[PDB]
């Protein structure tokens, strides 16, 4: 018979949503099984829904969205066999048995849930899109017959990728955050264009060598050392190899279509192989063992560059990079920043923890909105100990004005431009600090540092 809306849909937030779908005024208004069969789609995301009790009566649903709610039970879906697309990411679903017979599904999105058992998916052979990442899946057996899949993601405990053998239609695969070391099966997925394998245990990438249609590859956070196989993948435009143990970059030298290359957190001391990758706009080389960055002078299209946490003394090869917008090189050994002076398109400069004493070359970088210059530190060349040592202050702000020491060791004092100590007896060093707020464009920072003066006996 004609029931009230809120006795079908027992969940308060869904009752209220269905009221609006059905063109009614209150959630107590009654509706017929005919008013219900009018409803073929339902966008009910982020509405705080806890239960979909009532949805079984919307027999003609072809497409639903219940993402970003608090669903646990999805039994109401069991017999809505006209469903072709389900979006239900970001809930608390564990049991997906109710999906087992919805064989007309072409799209199923379930990432960010609590699913372990995916056996109920095994007969959904019309799926071309299946998203299962950020779940607790360890066994992907049930996938072996879903041969029409073009996009697939899953996590987060899979070791055995063999069930993927016949999924040869796959173009996009995300196996991020699993426990995979053996990727032999991926040799069979020759139509892959995008492979995301962040955060696994992969050391042998030989299987990828014939995946020549890959344009996007991430092996971020794996166990890579030898990357020789990547030389085959000449269609790559986007490559992430960050957080591995890579030192030899020769295999990348011919990958001239690369516009993005992430190599941070590796064992790299020679970037000569990168010299010909002139299409690069983003290059990340933080957390390596770099000193010589001369090959970077050829990469004229670079807009973003990271070099932080390296052993770099001379930054000057960057002077030709006129399109640079972001440059992070904190924690290096740079003293002279005169090579940065004509990089006027920089809006973000992060140069703390260097050996910078003179900011005057930064004065015309007026598109800066973010700036970091703290915690500089250097050691002067030793001078011979005597009771009265004085050294010049060389610390200059963006104006060219000397910055007066903030602290001076061993009771010393300052009379511009000189710092003077009176030392009773031998000490093997003196020091001073400086600390001054500075603004360049609209970016504000503390320019601070410690200068050490060794004293020889």
């Amino acid at each position: 018979q004609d029931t009230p809306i809120n006795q079908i849909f027992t969940d308060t937030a869904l009752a209220e949503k269905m009221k609006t779908v059905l063109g009614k005024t209150n959630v107590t208004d009654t509706v017929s099984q005919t008013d219900l069969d009018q409803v073929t789609t339902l966008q009910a995301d982020r509405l705080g829904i806890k239960s979909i009790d009532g949805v079984e009566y919307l027999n003609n649903l072809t497409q639903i969205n219940f993402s970003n709610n608090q669903l646990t039970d999805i039994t109401p879906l069991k017999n809505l066999t006209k469903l072709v697309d389900i979006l239900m990411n970001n809930n608390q679903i564990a049991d997906i048995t109710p999906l087992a017979n919805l064989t007309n599904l072409t799209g199923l999105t379930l990432f960010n849930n609590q699913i372990t058992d995916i056996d109920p998916l095994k007969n959904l052979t019309n799926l071309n899109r299946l998203e299962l990442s950020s779940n607790t899946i360890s066994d992907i057996s049930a996938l072996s017959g879903l041969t029409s899949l073009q996009q697939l993601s899953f996590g987060n405990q899979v070791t055995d990728l063999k069930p993927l053998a016949n999924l040869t239609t796959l173009e996009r695969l995300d196996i991020s955050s699993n426990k995979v070391s053996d990727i032999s099966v991926l040799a069979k997925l020759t139509n892959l264009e995008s492979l995301i394998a962040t955060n696994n245990q992969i050391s042998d990438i030989t299987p990828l060598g014939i995946l020549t249609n890959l344009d996007e590859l991430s092996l971020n956070g794996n166990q890579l050392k030898d990357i020789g196989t990547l030389a085959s993948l000449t269609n790559l435009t986007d490559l992430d190899l960050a957080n591995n143990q890579i030192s030899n970059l020769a295999p990348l030298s011919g990958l001239t279509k690369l516009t993005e290359l992430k190599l941070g957190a590796n064992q790299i001391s020679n970037i000569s192989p990168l010299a010909g990758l002139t299409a690069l706009t983003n290059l990340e080389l933080n957390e390596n063992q770099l000193e010589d960055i001369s090959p970077i002078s050829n990469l004229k299209n670079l807009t973003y560059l990271t070099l932080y946490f390296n052993n770099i003394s001379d930054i000057s090869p960057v002077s030709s990079l006129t399109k640079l917008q972001r440059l992070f090189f904190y924690n290096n050994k740079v003293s002279d920043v005169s090579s940065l002076a004509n990089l006027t398109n920089i809006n973000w400069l992060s140069a703390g923890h260097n050996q910078i004493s003179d900011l005057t070359p930064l004065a015309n970088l007026t598109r800066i909105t973010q700036l970091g210059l703290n915690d500089q530190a250097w050691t002067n060349a030793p001078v011979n100990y005597k009771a009265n040592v004085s050294i010049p202050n060389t610390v200059k702000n963006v104006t060219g004005a000397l910055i007066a020491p903030a602290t001076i060791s061993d009771g010393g004092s300052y009379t511009e431009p000189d710092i003077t100590w009176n030392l009773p007896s031998y000490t093997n060093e003196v020091s001073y600090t400086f600390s001054q707020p500075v603004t360049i464009g609209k970016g504000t920072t503390t320019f601070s540092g410690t200068v050490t003066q060794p004293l020889k006996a």
Partner: nanobody
Amino acid sequence: VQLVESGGGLVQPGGSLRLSCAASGFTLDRYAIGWFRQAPGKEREGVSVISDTITAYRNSVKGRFTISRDNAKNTVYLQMNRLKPEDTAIYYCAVRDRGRVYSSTWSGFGSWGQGTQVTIS
């Protein structure tokens, strides 16, 4: 990802203390590891960071503190010498994923431990 700080205590001005940041449930090789501290009514502030073998230190502790790792023990240490009253604080360790990019030495840290109280009389 679980971090545990220990080694805090009461110490005389000019004295020394060694903190340990013991990590369990993940390889420390995948993370940069940072020591932070927070004094009463102040912001939590970075003290030192190690990423692989490269280290960084806030100005006020340069020359006095040394961060180091024992990879065998999955532990990061902060050697604090010539301690001053200004170094009084609860000391915390945290990590950040070395596979990302960060705009500063101190940004992006998380998985904070319980902390260890350092008091200089």
